[PDB]
């Protein structure tokens, strides 16, 4: 039995997590009771699940915990896992680790100088494989295949909001930099430090879990020549929150710009612009707290205008850009009184609807009227009908949404133009900023979003790990058949198919009659016992769950009607595209069907286009760790670390590596470590036959291990076994 | 954990934890199917409704009763309903807490049986227990001693009580019970050209009955006033907004409770049964159940009834003897508010039959416990 | 996904069809389901008239072409001319294949059998269409009303149709079909105009007294009050100059036309008025759920676009129903289009796409799968 | 004196003496009113018609019915149809012979006091009475015990007596009669394109259903062979001369007897209130009742309804019942014939309301003279 005596196991704690403990005897089958040694004393007692006979997770031997990447270990459990990384942050301080493909990076919160010039030219010319797991080694990797292949790369950046993201994205920017010299012609990386402060302003949000948080899919290319040479860059935007404008959570607020711009109110120039309070601004008053403690969002404003000076965007433009946002939200007060036979109206001389007009130089007569009342056309006559208030107040947000939408695309222009070049690019590798996996106590058509994305991810991410398996299997002449491939396109498909989560949703949200309970009602209907993967709550009808590759999510079905609408009127579009302003005839330079798409729709569409740009692409795959969330330097939290490693995914790969072969090692690695289990009748002329020989008399079973032409494969554990052997032979 | 409590009323459900002063739910034990075509195509549907989901979808309904005679006619629709009560209306796990359940006295052995057997294989109780409702609605009277008319929707029933202790050769049991009453009330308003004739039209005949009619104290006498003054006439506006005028009958349908000759009965009138199951007591302890009269149940919410029963019970019994009927305001929940009280008594544990035992002993434990 | 072989949406009507794809806010394409033959010999051998004419380009031809209506009192007369009627759909106005696309068609309660077997069969024999449809007017015009209950009135040129629905239920007993429609109030139009010497006789000039029908005509909201102006102020006289150039004066007329919907008597029909055929079919009704028909008296169909309608029907029907009851009648623009808008509604839902009658459907089991995917 | 006998019939007025065979007048009760004004100096035509002679001016007058759910819905009319009688068809004073008249079970009070008084106020008549349908059907049968169901055209009621006694707690009244049958033919007949929309169109639709219809023994099985075989076809010329087949329409309406659904009811089928009328009666009684179900009233007189019904209550009852139905070769000529036979009985002599004993009592005489 591998519980022996000198075998640590592992032992669940509601605080540390998991605590190793020593056996103080050898268990026998059909013991129901293991004595146990805590560090704390011999004061425990285990009984055994007496129900199916589970021992607690056997820990690694001593030889095999001091490693860089955790497919090293023969044990693969969380236990084993997380205390890898524990140690290595701890002791050695060491932010990066290997699961496999994946670079692994936990937060320091603490200036690191492992990123000077004499590490970059240490690294550089050298093996990524012969190096420690490094940024600069998934950097070199990439810039290695595209000039080898002659084929574009993408490195995959994702976790939590504060785990470092954004920072690695600038160290390997840097190395994609000093690996070709560098392009003092262009100056890219000083455009990409002063583009992020803008793109973060007007794409992030405070949320409940952090002071600043992205809301939307990153894309940096970084282009290069013949001479792989950089020459320039361009920026991408995907998967953008569209609810944020205009509806707030509780506790959390709308995008930072919005409040920049409410803070600096009090100077002159703002003053024109007639902003006043973040509590009397509907898109602002919702949340609860429009302030953030420790900021002061007007120094913030002075940043980002500083920054917008460093790209060279006029401030003409930069004052044009506040004028208009000062005018979304003087729109969002417009507020219609209700009607008779399902209409609405509008006060005589109403203050906001005044300021909006005289703001955004349009007439107020008809942006009362076509708020009043809607145009109907047909192929005979045009008609005009009477608006309910909510079909008005639905009908103003989506306007918002929209040409805050135009807004956003047009500043990112701006960005391109200053990250763009004449010279034409030969070759490309991308940087993708993404987020991980969100789940709460409550979950919303945000979250539903988020985790729909990460999905897509996840498909190519499981395709990948089986592809270059499968291709190392046929190197070394190894049967395919002998590993398994575990996807997630049934969660996928759940979702977005006909009749699915999504499209039930839409349905839903053209109906007339259509309600979050009457969607609740069709999904228990058509998913309920069609989909084990779907499930409901027994004492609720307002929620439902869902099976993600991360865990189950449970999702309120209040709010996602509402928040799917995204339809305007183009008589609406008509009178804002005719504006006496210049700005506004450039924000709306086929339109006819992108102004009748619902949320989840647009959703759809930005997906799918971001997972084929992946897709052309060799992918690359990184994960941020954020190790806390008291921010201390080098201070670990065992229920953020696990917490963390669920949403990165990587304790389901570690999972998929050890349901098929993890440990493999050559047969002359192999003879130098077991030599000594070896009698001289056993030794033959030749390594592999002995090696080949001797192992099938230490494991009887054919299973446990896999021959190949220059390695030996093995399953879980055996190698911890031969190490079990080789210390009971010593003592 | 803290018991849940629950009469199985034959019209009326009422449920709760015990403790709470009031049942924190109540609903009409209706289950409601639809009668007619969905021609709304891609609609959301249901398959049958429950309590005020069928009584706000009436008409296109067809309604049913899973309970008749103070007996369950059928398990599927009582599985439904109990399965509302737990998850949808209380929202509580039944694995969590123990189930005080109802019946009236002579039900049949087999019915108490198979509630037993649901409770414990659909439901998971860990403990459960059935308890009389003449019992709880003496406890919710807080006197040792009285005897109880408990009348109801689909039952009515006589149970003399003293230092705690039944009589069981005493108690008598009636099928004359609310119901009747709405059945007949359609006989006498057809008398006027108010015909009546779905389910759905007996809800608003039986809500017309529960507002406007009440007992005579002498019944000549009010016919008498009804045939030369006619200033007892009530008008009631129907859903569709017509008035109906209603009179005469606002006295004749609950006169039925002492002449049931009106609807061919050859039973007794319920002072009769009261004098009778008194009768058949010791004559040493007679002086104190006519002391001691309670009324129960939703049908005893007649407006005069306890003055007419008065008056018909001291024309039957000795002129020496202090007749008393008592009536508690609350008579619509005196059965639950009794069994709230017997589950929060340290005394009950006993009673309660463990799932244990069920596996162990068979259904017929709960008569064991009983008896 | 942007792409759906995108279902055709066609109402067939009597006196005007419309068509359309589903998800097109509006029919794209409408035209008069008139078909027109030419009466005339060809003063030269390079004349070629077509053999026959469809809509507006028989329109552009009258008294030269004999105008002809494929469809009458809400059911099909000539399945030839249906097939050139439904063959210009396709090809000469959509310009799309009906091999690609699904189609929606439709028709009115209590209409035979065989009518609705004969269009199934010759959509999937002549056309060959992938999948096809067939759905009553009167939900699709409660789907583009928006509510799960009420009584709707669809009064069309060749039939009028009461149906009350609660729900998503409808009352099989409580449907009311009646044959006075606004042919018959065109057709009384010209007997009421010859008493000032108009008389009409060809069906060129009938397409003329129809469009002053459309034009002049308006409901009134007391009928004998309506008469002593007419008598009295005569100020009620609009002289319509006819297309050629003849001033025409057109004044109790304008009023006498439409009110034979409440007035059936004046065509010798025994039938109820519009109103009351409204009135009984919601006193046919379950008690409960008459006060939310009450509430929801929805119209229509091209015959309920008359002025003052929707006024006299709510005091019409609040003299019929007891006092205590909100009447309310539910009237909107552009009610000519109600049932299209309300079958391209009905084919862009995901749940309505298993519920198409197939080519390989009606191959296996014959023609009375519609009656079996129906009921 | 030789009293007279008339049954008011909602859609067929009977009427003779007391000691006649049958019937000696039988027409429509219809008044007709022309639709239409006058073409011609003079030729003066009557304000209304009555029975035969509006039949033969169908389409120039419409037809009324002065009778509705087997109540009066116009006394004038009910006057007019009775003066016919009495003088423009018996050719008799009503001055001179006594008036039984009849009325269904659960009809309005005010129904009877009003038919009383215009006989006694208008005809003069020195003496009356109203009797119930079913007991004079029941006498014409020739049983003292016997369950009578009365189908007519405007009522259906299932009446159960033994030893000459009924029992009004097991009474059971359906408004489903011919007339709604005839209303359905219409809409089943438009299915094939025969439409129709007059009261002098449905005449027809009510004479094809009179000759062409009959009631399947197993509805699935009839309609298996319409569908397959449709030898069922049959042909009918109109009186304009065209012809149109009716088929599978024939076995469709009468079912809606057995299935009132067609129509819409909640209501149930003739053989389910027959076989709950003989449940509701005493359990020594039923055996009786189940030998003798007696058939009664036009709506009965369908070819196969006898052997469905049997089949039927074969399928409900115990199999140790003998289900026994009896169906009077003159089923329409059963009520009448027993009023005759009450007519000519000389002990019944005593229960006649006299001209004086109305003037005592106002209009209730009738009421209490029955009960
Ligand atoms: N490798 C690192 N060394 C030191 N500090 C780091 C490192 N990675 C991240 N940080 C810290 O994290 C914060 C910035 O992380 P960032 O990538 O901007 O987060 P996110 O992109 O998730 O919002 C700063 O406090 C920064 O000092
Ligand atoms: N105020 C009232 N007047 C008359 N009858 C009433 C009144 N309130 C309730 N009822 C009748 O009492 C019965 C319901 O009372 P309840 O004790 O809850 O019966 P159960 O428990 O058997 O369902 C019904 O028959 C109802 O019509
Ligand atoms: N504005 C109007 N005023 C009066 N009658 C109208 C008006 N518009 C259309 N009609 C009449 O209504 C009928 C058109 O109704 P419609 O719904 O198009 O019928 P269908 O679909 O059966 O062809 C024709 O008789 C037409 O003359
Ligand atoms: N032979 C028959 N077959 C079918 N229906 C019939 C037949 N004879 C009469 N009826 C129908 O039965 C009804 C006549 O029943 P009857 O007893 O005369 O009623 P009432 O006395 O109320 O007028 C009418 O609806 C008539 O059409
Ligand atoms: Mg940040
Ligand atoms: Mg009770
Ligand atoms: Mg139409
Ligand atoms: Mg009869």
Redesign the interface.
Known sequence: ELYTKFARVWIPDPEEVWKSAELLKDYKPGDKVLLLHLEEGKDLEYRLDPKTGELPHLRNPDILVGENDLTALSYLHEPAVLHNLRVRFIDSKLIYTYCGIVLVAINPYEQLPIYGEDIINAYSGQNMGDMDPHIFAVAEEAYKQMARDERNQSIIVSGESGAGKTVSAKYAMRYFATVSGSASEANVEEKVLASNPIMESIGNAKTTRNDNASRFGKYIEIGFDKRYRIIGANMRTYLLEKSRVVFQAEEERNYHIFYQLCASAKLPEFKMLRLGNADSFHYTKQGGSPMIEGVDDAKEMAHTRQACTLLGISESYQMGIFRILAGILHLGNVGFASRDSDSCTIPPKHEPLTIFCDLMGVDYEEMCHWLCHRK??????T?I?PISKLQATNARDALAKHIYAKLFNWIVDHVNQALHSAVKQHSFIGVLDIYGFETFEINSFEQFCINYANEKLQQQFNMHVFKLEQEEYMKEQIPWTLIDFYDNQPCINLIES??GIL??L??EC????GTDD?WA??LY?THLNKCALFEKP????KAFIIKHFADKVEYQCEGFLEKNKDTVFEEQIKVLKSSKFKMLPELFQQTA?EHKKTVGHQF?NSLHLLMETLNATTPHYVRCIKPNDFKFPFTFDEKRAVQQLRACGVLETIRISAAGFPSRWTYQEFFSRYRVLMKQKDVLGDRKQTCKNVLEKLILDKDKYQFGKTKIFFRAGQVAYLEKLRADKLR | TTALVCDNGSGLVKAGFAGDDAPRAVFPSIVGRPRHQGVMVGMGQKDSYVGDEAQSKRGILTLKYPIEHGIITNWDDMEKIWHHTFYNELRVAPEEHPTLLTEAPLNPKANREKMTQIMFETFNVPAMYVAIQAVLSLYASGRTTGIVLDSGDGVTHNVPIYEGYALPHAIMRLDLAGRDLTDYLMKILTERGYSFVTTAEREIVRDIKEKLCYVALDFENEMATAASSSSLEKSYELPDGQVITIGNERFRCPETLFQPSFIGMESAGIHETTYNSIMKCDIDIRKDLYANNVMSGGTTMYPGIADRMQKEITALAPSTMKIKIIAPPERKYSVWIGGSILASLSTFQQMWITKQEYDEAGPSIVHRKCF
Do not use: I
Request: proline share 4%; aromatic share 4%.
């Open positions: 109907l056309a047909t192929a005979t006559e008609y009908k006909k009749l499209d039930l839409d349905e053209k109906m007339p009659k009457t009602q069709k209907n027994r004492m609720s009808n069907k759809r």
